[PDB]
Amino acid sequence: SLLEFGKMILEETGKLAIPSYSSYGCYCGWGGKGTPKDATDRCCFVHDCCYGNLPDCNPKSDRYKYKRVNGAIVCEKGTSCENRICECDKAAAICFRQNLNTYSKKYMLYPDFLCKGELKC
Numbered sequence: 001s002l003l004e005f006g007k008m009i010l011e012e013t014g015k016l017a018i019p020s021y022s023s024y025g026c027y028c029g030w031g032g033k034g035t036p037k038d039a040t041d042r043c044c045f046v047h048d049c050c051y052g053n054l055p056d057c058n059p060k061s062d063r064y065k066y067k068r069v070n071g072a073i074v075c076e077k078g079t080s081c082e083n084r085i086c087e088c089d090k091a092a093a094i095c096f097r098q099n100l101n102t103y104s105k106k107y108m109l110y111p112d113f114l115c116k117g118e119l120k121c
């Protein structure tokens with residue numbers, strides 16, 4: 001679920017998901033279109049594609065369980081949808097952590113009109 005994902009993001013990065021990752025670039029949050037602005041935004045593009053692999057799952061609301069094995073995220077067994085949603089969220093949180101060094105506040109609240117075009121998953 002979005003609330004869990006926000007907690008996983010905060011745990012990984014030390015940034016609050018809202019507002020650091022909820023309106024960032026072209027894909028973090030509302031998403032849709034354009035060339036991702038930077039590595040962090042690319043994390044969000046891939047996460048959007050990951051959710052898109054799961055058209056009959058409901059990632060905003062479906063809760064999954066995960067644990068920490070020392071710092072590593074281990075998705076625990078739930079339903080198929082929950083397992084897959086967890087792996088998508090885990091990857092995004094790790095991606096955000098791996099790209100904190102280039103995270104840029106100038107991309108927060110990035111305007112939709114600067115995000116134009118395709119980019120297939």
Ligand SMILES: COc1ccc2c(c1)c(CC(=O)O)c(C)n2C(=O)c1ccc(Cl)cc1
Nearest residue numbers: 029031048049051052055056057058059060
């Ligand atoms: C490839 O682009 C997508 C497609 C679907 C998406 C998202 C991004 C994000 C992006 C996000 O919030 O990070 C969410 C939440 N999607 C869904 O929830 C969703 C839910 C139910 C169905 Cl049936 C289909 C899709």
